[PDB]
């Protein structure tokens, strides 16, 4: 988890930002415009006595006050997660039916947005997205003593400094049994056969969200021989996928489209069996991975291009 130069800098930058920031309070924000949405909608606000432009995240919830003060202590967690590879935090409170959740504003958006413009992402452009995930992962893991519970597209942020984060990994107990929707589709077999679940089933959630922005679709079920002409040239309810995950093969990439090393790469972190499947140290030095490290690969410039930022 060492940092160069620019990336200390930058963490540097964003606490001394922070720190002028003071108590967060209803009154104090202007919103812009709408990011998403979910069991909340994310507006870009204007937080206007400090001039930041930031993501705040609504979540409407009616709760008596004992509830709301236990959420907004378990919350004050995030401001200790400092890292490159995590989504800056501002604060949290409660105003009228709603907790806000306050965080650096990522200009380029979530990955299920970055998919949807691209249509599909390169397999270069992957190899930092993974290092960013293994790094955050790690980072959550090795400081904080926590899992993520939540990888998916829709929850890695990308800039375009060329930065890509996690966001939304559950920080408060309260939060979720208050709540208890978001999907299960990204959920590893042990976690949905209800089963032994660590980091392990974090590797899955990344290993399935890489082969949906890699083909451009839902990787579930499996492409047929026509579908893959359509892709590369060369319905499912939510229950019946679930029991597909727990029940079939895994997914794969396609071969002759994808090196043989992302291929190995994705297989390993989606093994059914979570003691076969890599675990974070072994993905830091898989072939992959060391060599999407040495490529000086331009994500930045690929991202803005590609969703017209600028
Ligand atoms: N979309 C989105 C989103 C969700 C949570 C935090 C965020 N910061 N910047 C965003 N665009 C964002
Ligand atoms: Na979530």
Redo the contacts with the bound molecule.
Sequence with gaps: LELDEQQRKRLEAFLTQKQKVGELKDDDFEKISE??AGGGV?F?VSHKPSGLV??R?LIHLEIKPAIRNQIIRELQVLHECNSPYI?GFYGAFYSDGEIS?C????????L??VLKKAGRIPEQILGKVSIAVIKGLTYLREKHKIMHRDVKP??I?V?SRGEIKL??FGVSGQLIDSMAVGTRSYMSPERLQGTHYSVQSDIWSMGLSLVEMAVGRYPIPPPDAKELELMFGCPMAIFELLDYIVNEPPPKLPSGVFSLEFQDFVNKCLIKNPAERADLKQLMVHAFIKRSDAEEVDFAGWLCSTIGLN
């Design positions: 990011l998403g994310v870009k930031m993501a995240k989504v959740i965080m650096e504003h990522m200009d380029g958006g979530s299920d947005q829709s929850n942020l800039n966001c939304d």
